[PDB]
Design a protein around this ligand. Structure first.
Ligand code: NI
Ligand code: NI
Lengths: 569, 238, 79
C-alpha cells in the first residue's frame, strides 16, 4: 500500500479533497469538498495506462456499459464542488462516482462500468460544469447561437423572429405561424431552444394558441404594451397551461406603477427581466420587485459587473431597442431617467445577497450573448474583493459563494422555465450537456462543449497538423454538430399542450422534443442559494436602494478579472 | 340454512376459540391468537344467549384471562380485542380493552426511545392571540390550517394571524367551546407560503398585499375580527 | 371628460408628467369601431355613453384620481 505525494498525485489525477483551485484569474477560491475515487484505482487512459482490455476496462461489462467516461473530473455544481468520474450513456449522465472494471476494481457500480463500448475522455485537472442556460435571448440573428455556445451556454430560451424590430426590442416570437418558422429553423442549430410568446394581449383565445403552438411561455414587453390587463390575462392562461412567464415592467408608468404591476401579477409566479432597471422597467422602483416571494428576479447583463464605464455606456442602447430615435423630446427624457448609477450599483450586492437569482443576456438588445457566464463570475470576484468572503462560507474557500453565482445561469434559470428535470446541473439522470473548463480559463474560455453526451464543439487546432494542439487554436464544430447527429443531441422545448397535440410530428421536427413542466408551483424560495426574500425600497429622490432597512450599493470598479488577459479583442 | 359468509367466518372463529379454551384447560399458557380468539369467541356466545349487554361484555371480557394464564408477551400484545356479535337488538361491536396485564417482563417490539425532547417547528418565532368563541357551537382548528380563515366565529385579530398556523404538533388541533376564550400560539406558514383553498380568502401567495384582500373579503363575508373597510381601494384582480 | 379619447398628437409619440407637473392635454375621440379592450380593464367593450357609467364606476373603486364618485350606482347584469 505504498504512498505518494500530493505534488505528484494531483498532476496525475487532479486536485483531490482539501485541495483548492483558483477560478481563472479571479480571487475566487474553490475547494474540493469530496472525492469518490479509491486512491490506487483511479482511471487513466493512455499508452500503458489503466483504461485497457481486461484491466480498467471490463471484458465482462455490466449490461449498462457506459458510452463515455470523463475520468477524474472536478465537479463544480450547485450540488457540491467535488471530485469523481462522470459517466455518460444514451446522451445522459448515467452515473457520477468511481466506475471502472468490477473484475479488478473494489468499488465500481454497474452504473459506472467501463467496457469495450465506452470511449475515454480525460478530465483530470479540469473542471466539469453543466452548460449555462441564458434565458433572455432576443433571436435577432442566428449568429448569436454559436457565440453563446462558445461561452459555456448549452440552452437558450427567448423569443423572436430575426432582425425585425419587434424582436430587436422584445424576446417574443408572436403568433403560432412565426412559431412554426423558428421551431423549424431551430432544427439547424446546436443549442437547446425554447421560444416565448406575446403575453401582450388581452385576448385569452389568442393567448392560448401560441402555447398550443410550441411556446414554452409568454413575454410581456413594454414596447408591446405591458398593461395590467395584458399582464393579468397572460398570467392566467399561463397558469392553466403550466408554462412560465417573463416581464419587462411598464417604464413610462402610463398605466400605473410597480404597485399596480405587482398587484396584477396577483402573487402568481413571474420571471422578471433586468429587474435592476437599466434593462428597462417601472422607473425608479422596479428593482424593489426582486425582494418579493412570487418573483423570479433576473439581471440583464451590461450593468454587470459595475465598472467606471458602465453608466457612460447605456445612454445610447435605449435608442437601439425601443426605437427611441435620438431626437424626439419625450424620448430624450426618460431614457435619461432610467440609467440610475444607483440601481446599477446595488445590483452586484443584491446578487451577492441572493436578492437576484438569474443572469440573463438580452442578446443584441442591451446585453452580450457571449458574456453571461464571464460577467457572472467577474461580478463575483468583485464582490469578494469589496466585501470579502461570506458569512455562510465554511473553510478557507469561497465554495458557497461559487455555488451561488454558478446556479445563477444553470439550475436557477432551468427551474425558472420548467426544464430542471432534463438539464441545468451535473446530476445523474439529466441530459448530458456538459462543458470541461481548464481552471486557468474558467468563466471565459471553455475547452469543449459536449451536447447530449457527445462532443458538439471544442477547442481545435490546425486541422492538418500531426496533433490537435497546434495553432491556430479556436473553436471548431465537432461531429455532434453535424448530420442527423445534431438532431439526436438537441432539445427544442415546448409546452405539454403542444407536446401532446404532437407538435413534433406536426412540424416534422427531427430534434429531440420535451415539454416544460412545473412552472406555476415555483417561487423565489425555489431559487438555489439565491432564495432570499426581503422588503426593499427605493427613494424616489436620491434613488437609493434599501433592503430590510440598511442601504445597499456596490462601488464602481476600474478593472475586472476574466478580461483583457484572455481575448485579443 | 342460508349460511352467509359472515356466519361461516364466525363458526370458524368460534372453534378457533374452543381450541383455545381447551388448551389452557389442559394447563397451557395461551399465546396471542389463542387469547384473542378465546376472548372474542366468548362474547359471541354471550351475545347469543341474549343476557349480557354490549356495555357489559365490553367489560366482562377483561375478566376472562388472568395474567398468569397467557404467555409472556401476550399481555402487552393484545392492546384490545374488537368483536361484533349479534344481540337480540341486532349486531353490535363489543370492544374489549386491555383484557390482560404486564405480569411479565417481556414486551415484543417494545420501544427504547432515548429520553429527551424534540423541538417542533424549529426557529419559528411564535405569537399569541386572544381567541373567543362567540358562537353556540364548538370549533376545532388544526395544525396546518390557515388560522386567519378559521370559522367566522372565532373572534380575534385576523390581521395578526394572516399566513400562520397553530404552533403545535403536526397533526393535532385546538378546541373552542362555545364561549371559551384563549390565546393560541401561531407561527408563520413555511414552504412557498402559497395559500389556496380553505375559505377562499387568499388563494394566492402570502403577501402583505395579498393580505389586504383577504382582510377585505373576510370583512364582507363576516368573519369576526376582520377589521373594517376604511375606503378600500380595489385591485384589478380579486 | 376623457372617456374614449386619445392625446391628439403625432401617431406614436407621447406626453410626459413630472411628479407634480400640471398641464392641459389635447385629446380627440378614438376612431375606428371605438372598441376599447385592455389597458386597465376599465372598459373592455364598445365606447358607449352607457359603457362609460361602468368605467367611471370601476375607476372609482380602483382609485383613479378624478374618477368622480358613486352616487348610488345602479348595477347592471354584466360588468
Ligand atoms: Ni428587455
Ligand atoms: Ni430584453
Amino acid at each position: 500500500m505504498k504512498k505518494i505525494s500530493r505534488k505528484e498525485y494531483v498532476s496525475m489525477y487532479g486536485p483531490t479533497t482539501g485541495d483548492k483551485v483558483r477560478l481563472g484569474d479571479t480571487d475566487l477560491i474553490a475547494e474540493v469538498e469530496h472525492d469518490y475515487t479509491i486512491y490506487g484505482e483511479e482511471l487513466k487512459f493512455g499508452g500503458g495506462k489503466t483504461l485497457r482490455e481486461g484491466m480498467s476496462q471490463s471484458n465482462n461489462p455490466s449490461k449498462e456499459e457506459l458510452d463515455l467516461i470523463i475520468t477524474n473530473a472536478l465537479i463544480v455544481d450547485y450540488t457540491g464542488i467535488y471530485k469523481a468520474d462522470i459517466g455518460i450513456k444514451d446522451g445522459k449522465i448515467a452515473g457520477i462516482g468511481k466506475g471502472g472494471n468490477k473484475d479488478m476494481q473494489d468499488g465500481v457500480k454497474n452504473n459506472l462500468s467501463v467496457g469495450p463500448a465506452t470511449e475515454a475522455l480525460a478530465g483530470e485537472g479540469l473542471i466539469v460544469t453543466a452548460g449555462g442556460i441564458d434565458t433572455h435571448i432576443h433571436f435577432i440573428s442566428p449568429q448569436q447561437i454559436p457565440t453563446a455556445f462558445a461561452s459555456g451556454v448549452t440552452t437558450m430560451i427567448g423569443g423572436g423572429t430575426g432582425p425585425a424590430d419587434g424582436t430587436n426590442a422584445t424576446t417574443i416570437t408572436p403568433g403560432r405561424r412565426n412559431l412554426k418558422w423558428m421551431l423549424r429553423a431551430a432544427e439547424e442549430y446546436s443549442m437547446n431552444l425554447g421560444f416565448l410568446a406575446k403575453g401582450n394581449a388581452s385576448n385569452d383565445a389568442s393567448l392560448a394558441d401560441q402555447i398550443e403552438a410550441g411556446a414554452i411561455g409568454f413575454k410581456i414587453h413594454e414596447d408591446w404594451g405591458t398593461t395590467p390587463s395584458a399582464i393579468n390575462h397572460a398570467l392566467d392562461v399561463a397558469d392553466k397551461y403550466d408554462v412560465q412567464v417573463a416581464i419587462h415592467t411598464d417604464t413610462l408608468n402610463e398605466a400605473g406603477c410597480v404597485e399596480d404591476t405587482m398587484a396584477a401579477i396577483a402573487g402568481r409566479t413571474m420571471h422578471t427581466f433586468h429587474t435592476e432597471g437599466a434593462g428597462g422597467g417601472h422607473a425608479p422602483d422596479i428593482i424593489k420587485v426582486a425582494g418579493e416571494h412570487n418573483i423570479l428576479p433576473a439581471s440583464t447583463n451590461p450593468t454587470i459587473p459595475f465598472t467606471v464605464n458602465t453608466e457612460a455606456e447605456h445612454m445610447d442602447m435605449l435608442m437601439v431597442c425601443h426605437h427611441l430615435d435620438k431626437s424626439i423630446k419625450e424620448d430624450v427624457q426618460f431614457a435619461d431617467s432610467r440609467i440610475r448609477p444607483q440601481t446599477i450599483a446595488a445590483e452586484d450586492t443584491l446578487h451577492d445577497m441572493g436578492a437576484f437569482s438569474i443572469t440573463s443576456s438580452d442578446s443584441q438588445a442591451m446585453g452580450r450573448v457571449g458574456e453571461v457566464i464571464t460577467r457572472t463570475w467577474q461580478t463575483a470576484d468583485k464582490n469578494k474583493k469589496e466585501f470579502g468572503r461570506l458569512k455562510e462560507e465554511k473553510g478557507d474557500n469561497d465554495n458557497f459563494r461559487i455555488k451561488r453565482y454558478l446556479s445563477k445561469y444553470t439550475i436557477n434559470p432551468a427551474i425558472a422555465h420548467g426544464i430542471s428535470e432534463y438539464v441545468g446541473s451535473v446530476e445523474v439522470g439529466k441530459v448530458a450537456d456538459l462543458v470541461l473548463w481548464s481552471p486557468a480559463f474558467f468563466g471565459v474560455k471553455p475547452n469543449m462543449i459536449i451536447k447530449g453526451g457527445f462532443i458538439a464543439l471544442s477547442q481545435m487546432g490546425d486541422a492538418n497538423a500531426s496533433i490537435p494542439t497546434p495553432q491556430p487554436v479556436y473553436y471548431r464544430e465537432m461531429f455532434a454538430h453535424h448530420g442527423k447527429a445534431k438532431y439526436d443531441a438537441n432539445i427544442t422545448f415546448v409546452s405539454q399542450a403542444a407536446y401532446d397535440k404532437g407538435i413534433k410530428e406536426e412540424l416534422g421536427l427531427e430534434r429531440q422534443v420535451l415539454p416544460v413542466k412545473n412552472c406555476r408551483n415555483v417561487t423565489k424560495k425555489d431559487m438555489q442559494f439565491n432564495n432570499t426574500t426581503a422588503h426593499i425600497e427605493v427613494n424616489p429622490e436620491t434613488y437609493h436602494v434599501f433592503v430590510d432597512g440598511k442601504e445597499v450599493t456596490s462601488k464602481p470598479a476600474n478593472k475586472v478579472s476574466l478580461a483583457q488577459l484572455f481575448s485579443i479583442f | 340454512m342460508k349460511l352467509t359468509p359472515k356466519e361461516l367466518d364466525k363458526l370458524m372463529l368460534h372453534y378457533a376459540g374452543e381450541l383455545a379454551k381447551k388448551r389452557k384447560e389442559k394447563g397451557i399458557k395461551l399465546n396471542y391468537v389463542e387469547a384473542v380468539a378465546l376472548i372474542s369467541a366468548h362474547i359471541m356466545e354471550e351475545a347469543r344467549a341474549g343476557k349480557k349487554t354490549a356495555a357489559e361484555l365490553m367489560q366482562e371480557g377483561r375478566t376472562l384471562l388472568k395474567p398468569d394464564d397467557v404467555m409472556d408477551g401476550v399481555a402487552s400484545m393484545i392492546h384490545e380485542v374488537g368483536i361484533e356479535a349479534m344481540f337480540p337488538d341486532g349486531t353490535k361491536l363489543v370492544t374489549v380493552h386491555t383484557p390482560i396485564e404486564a405480569n411479565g417482563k417481556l414486551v415484543p417490539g417494545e420501544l427504547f426511545l432515548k429520553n429527551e425532547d424534540i423541538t417542533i417547528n424549529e426557529g419559528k418565532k411564535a405569537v399569541s392571540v386572544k381567541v373567543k368563541n362567540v358562537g353556540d357551537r364548538p370549533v376545532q382548528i388544526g395544525s396546518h390550517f390557515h388560522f386567519f380563515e378559521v370559522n367566522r366565529c372565532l373572534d380575534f385579530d385576523r390581521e395578526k394571524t394572516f399566513g400562520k398556523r397553530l404552533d403545535i404538533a403536526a397533526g393535532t388541533a385546538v378546541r373552542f367551546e362555545p364561549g371559551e376564550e384563549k390565546s393560541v400560539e401561531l407561527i408563520d406558514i413555511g414552504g412557498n407560503r402559497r395559500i389556496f383553498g380553505f375559505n377562499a380568502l387568499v388563494d394566492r401567495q402570502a403577501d402583505n398585499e395579498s393580505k389586504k384582500i383577504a382582510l377585505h373579503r373576510a370583512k364582507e363575508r363576516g368573519f369576526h375580527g376582520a377589521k373594517s373597510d376604511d375606503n378600500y381601494v380595489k385591485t384589478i384582480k380579486e
